[PDB]
Write a protein that binds this ligand. Sequence first.
Ligand code: NAI
Length: 405
Amino acid sequence: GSHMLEMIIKPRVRGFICVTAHPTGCEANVKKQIDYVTTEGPIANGPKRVLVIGASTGYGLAARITAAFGCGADTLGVFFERPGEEGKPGTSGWYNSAAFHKFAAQKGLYAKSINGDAFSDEIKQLTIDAIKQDLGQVDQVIYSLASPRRTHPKTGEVFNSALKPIGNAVNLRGLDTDKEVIKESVLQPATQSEIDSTVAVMGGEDWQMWIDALLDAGVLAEGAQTTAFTYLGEKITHDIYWNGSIGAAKKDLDQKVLAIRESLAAHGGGDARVSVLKAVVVQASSAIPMMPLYLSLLFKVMKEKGTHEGCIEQVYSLYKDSLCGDSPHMDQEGRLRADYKELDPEVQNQVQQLWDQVTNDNIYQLTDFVGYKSEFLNLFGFGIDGVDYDADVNPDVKIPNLIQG
Ligand SMILES: NC(=O)C1=CN([C@@H]2O[C@H](COP(=O)(O)OP(=O)(O)OC[C@H]3O[C@@H](n4cnc5c(N)ncnc54)[C@H](O)[C@@H]3O)[C@@H](O)[C@H]2O)C=CC1
């Protein structure tokens, strides 16, 4: 019988990483984000043909949902995910994208996806072909890539990004989510090679290659728009994201966008912006001990002010207010800001005060570690309402219109 091909999927955590995902729960999570967008209402004057680079999880998935179900856009998505198979659940991003194709088709929306290395020339060429065959051109390009490594499309060199400070070693407090102990560790300052590598991986070169491979193709509409997602944060994380190796990468983004805006604004009044979003739980959060503690504190503080939100709420506002509306939130460098509720002085002062009082004993009285754990499990499709986690499921979920690179 088919029970031999099905299985009961449960959370399995190895190395602060959940190595399983639940297809039914992932589908329920995507539908929850779709339902939020539709309940909030349509978004006027948004793009109608959208390319989302990094479209399977987190903010990129939220952008695909907002564009599709908020602006009514046909969406082409690029991601790097593992399909499921007998006895081996695929990645959450695979099941999320399967659900997106299903729900998009129900609403008569075009949904095609490409699975492969977005840093490579091959994948850029497949994406170009897809646009030529189906859409003609795209109005908006969302760059939402997060990877620890990058294979250079020319030299073949493999760059690995580093999460380290610059100048002086730093003592970072954090929360070990396997042991549930508050703990500190010292990070050494990044070497020059580590900094260049992080710029190469998380900088803006690949975003630039995408736009310049699409422009000479040519598949960008008049008034075309593009934005890249980033995080700046405040003092608690500044040793890494302001001044650290990743801060060096974000400094790269800030200058490469200038070249992109120049090229687009001559092309029908288009526009390009770095968009700064708030911190959220992602698949890799528990692997950096600082973020679980910061997010747990931030969640409690913001919940007490009625300002807590996740990916789909952040990105729905970015579209409605800044990318397509007339409530844009520019900053001195020319970045779009949607993180202002996280950076509110009273929130950060309260997170900082608590940051110095949390111990192993009072974690659940001072932080929303409960909420962090729930949202973390939700990423992989676990703990979702309405899902019968006792039922067998076939982990081999297929995706129509999925180009395998
Ligand atoms: N997580 C956070 O708190 C914040 C993240 N951001 C930014 O948002 C953007 C999205 O990242 P996140 O959503 O955090 O994590 P994420 O892991 O949720 O999403 C990463 C996406 O990139 C895709 N991807 C990774 N390597 C790839 C490759 N080689 N080829 C093709 N696709 C590949 C994945 O399939 C996935 O769709 C990033 O630029 C990040 O810096 C901005 C503010 C806060």
